[PDB]
Paper text:
TRIM21 plays a crucial role in immune defence, acting as an E3 ubiquitin ligase that facilitates the ubiquitination and degradation of target proteins via the proteasome pathway. TRIM21 has a unique position within the TRIM family due to its ability to specifically bind to the Fc region of intracellular antibodies, resulting in the degradation of antibody-coated proteins or of non-enveloped viral particles.
To further investigate the binding mechanism, mouse TRIM21 was used as a structural surrogate due to its improved protein stability and high sequence similarity to the human counterpart. To understand its mode of binding, we solved the high-resolution crystal structure of the murine TRIM21 PRYSPRY domain in complex with suramin at 1.3 Å resolution. Interestingly, TRIM21 residues located within 5 Å of the suramin binding site are highly conserved between the human and mouse orthologues, even though the suramin binding site is located far from the substrate binding site. The only species-specific difference within this binding site is the substitution of lysine (Lys464) in the mouse protein with threonine in the human protein. Overall, the compound binding induced minimal structural changes, with only slight adjustments of side chains in the surrounding residues compared with the apo structure. A notable exception is the outward movement of the C-terminal region (Cys466 and Pro467) to form a pocket that was completely occupied by a tolyl moiety of suramin.
Author numbering: 283 to 467
Write the structure that this text describes.
């Protein structure tokens, strides 16, 4: 029988896209910033300038929902992006460039609108839910630590083809950002 229900997709990390200093777990569900270049070959899909990686999953219709653990991290970016986004060089995270993201940077949460939007979060998230509804043109972020309170919704999105989960683990020169981003094992 038809029943309104939630469904959480299993996201795994695409090692070929990962910046070469990222350490990805054997099950491809966690990623952290390493202190050495890893034994991985460069290639065209790999993010060169930032500690970024894509989910392997790719979709161009329907609904997708996944959660990410961000505990003990002082910096990260999360969301969804076009399959076709730039991998090499410096770039801003904006819908203009094919990214629908939020981030934490120096104790401030922001949405990656153009220009950036301050997010007034009362309870720092430990887990974040990311929902995409392709046909609706919606990317929504939820604060699992605050009973799933809505953090931000991008609406009227221009997806313009296949999408990928997007992650930035942030740098760890400070020593306060070693913890991984984690997807459900």
């Amino acid at each position: 029988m038809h029943h309104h229900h939630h469904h959480m997709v299993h996201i795994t990390l695409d090692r070929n896209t990962a910046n070469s200093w990222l350490i990805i777990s054997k099950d491809r569900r966690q990623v952290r910033m390493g202190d050495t270049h890893q034994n991985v070959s460069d290639n065209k899909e790999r993010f060169s300038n930032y500690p970024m990686v894509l989910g392997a999953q790719r979709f161009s219709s329907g609904k997708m929902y996944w959660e990410v653990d961000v505990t003990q991290k002082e910096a990260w970016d999360l969301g969804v992006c076009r399959d076709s986004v730039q991998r090499k060089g410096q770039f801003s995270l904006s819908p203009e460039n094919g990214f629908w993201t939020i981030w934490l940077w120096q104790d401030s949460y922001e949405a990656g609108t153009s220009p950036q939007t301050t997010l007034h979060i009362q309870v720092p998230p430990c887990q974040i839910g990311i929902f995409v509804d392709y046909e609706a043109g919606v990317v929504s972020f939820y604060n699992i630590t605050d009973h799933g309170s809505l953090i931000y919704t991008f609406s009227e999105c221009v997806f313009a083809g296949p999408l990928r989960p997007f992650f930035n683990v942030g740098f760890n020169y400070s020593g306060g950002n070693a913890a991984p981003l984690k997807l459900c094992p």
